[PDB]
């Protein structure tokens, strides 16, 4: 099992898996930090809008009152954030596919 | 890695790295999940008009992807936590669409949570 | 872990290595598939119309909804993917079971 985290749904919080050495670092409800460079699959389920942040940037927007994430290249210190404007049919996580170069 | 694939027709269900098996088929287009895991679903609808145009993807009773057409070719699936006992299926409003059309599944990971 | 990435410019093709090569650069934004398997294609159109193609068929188009490109497909030897504009993308080989 690769390095992977999930957060949610409540009141389960941040579950880590193959943590040693870490690839991700929880930092809040719905926010975590990238400890290692790589290719990451982000996923989840969101049960007026939701936005998915890679640090400063809205990489998804979920503007229906659905699935979340996709695949990205990420680097030490990138934060990923799932922001809200019914939180138990809601969760996201991330799995680390590979570490190329760049 | 445990995986499967339906179609495109005349091929029916095909199964890769079993033992232990992660999924089992129900009928054409419908499969069952025999274990908990993080799964990646994929495939593609080849569009090819008396009924409205639609295909949907279900987990259990929940439509989880609606592919309301652009009668172009569109990706099926996405990433999902699935449980022993779920069933995934792909439903045609009518049979319309073509047969460069298939959908398949692969189990990425099965962690405790 | 067979993979490759084209942008973002002026980086061009960037390929990690691999037991046997699963992929070969054809030219900018375009690659050819050298082995059957399941692949995950990814990228970002940059935080108009962009389009992903497998051979002659268009499999995704971006145009401000909300996105990054790609998805997961079963690709075959001799297939090609490009991205056309009218930003980077990459591919990884997830698997390649005997049923291709």
CA–CA separation, B108 and B112 (whole Å): 14
CA–CA separation, C57 and C76 (whole Å): 14
Burial tier of A95 (Cβ tally within 10 Å: 0-12, 13-18, 19+): buried
CA–CA separation, A9 and A44 (whole Å): 10
Contact: A41, B111; criterion CB under 8 Å: no
B1-113 CATH: 2.60.120.40
CA–CA separation, A97 and B5 (whole Å): 22
Could you state, in order of their start, the residue ranges of all structural domains in chain A? 1-102
DSSP state of C17: -
Instruction: State the fold for domain C1-100.
Output: Jelly Rolls (2.60.120)
Q: How many CA atoms lie less than 13 Å away from A89 in the CB half-sphere?
A: 6
Q: CA distances (Å), A28 to each of A13, A32, A57, C45, in order?
A: 9, 7, 18, 29
Conformational region of residue B26, where left means phi above 0, alpha means psi within -120 to 50, and beta covers everything else: alpha
Among candidates A72, A98, A102 on the partner chain, residue whose Cβ is nearest the Cβ of C68: A72
CA–CA separation, B102 and B7 (whole Å): 5
Distance in Å, alpha carbon of A72 to nearest chain C alpha carbon: 7
Q: Is the CATH number of domain A1-102 3.30.70.80?
A: no
Residues of A in contact with C11 (CB under 8 A): 102
Task: Check if the beta carbon of residue B66 is closer than 8 Å to that of residue B92.
Answer: no
CA–CA separation, C85 and B38 (whole Å): 34
CA–CA separation, C19 and B70 (whole Å): 39
Q: Interface partners of A (3+ CB pairs, < 8 Å)? A: B, C
Angle at the Cα of B8 (from C33 to B6), degrees rounded to 5?
100
């Amino acid at each position: 099992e690769p390095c992977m985290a999930k957060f949610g749904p409540l009141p389960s919080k941040w579950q880590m898996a193959s943590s040693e050495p870490p690839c991700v670092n929880k930092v809040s409800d719905w926010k975590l930090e990238i400890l290692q460079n790589g290719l990451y699959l982000i996923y989840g389920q969101v049960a007026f809008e939701v936005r998915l942040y890679k640090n400063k940037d809205m990489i998804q927007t979920l503007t229906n009152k659905q699935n979340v994430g996709g695949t990205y290249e990420l680097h030490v210190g990138d934060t990923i954030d799932l922001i809200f404007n019914l939180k138990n049919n809601t969760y996201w996580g991330i799995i680390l596919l590979a570490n190329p170069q760049f």
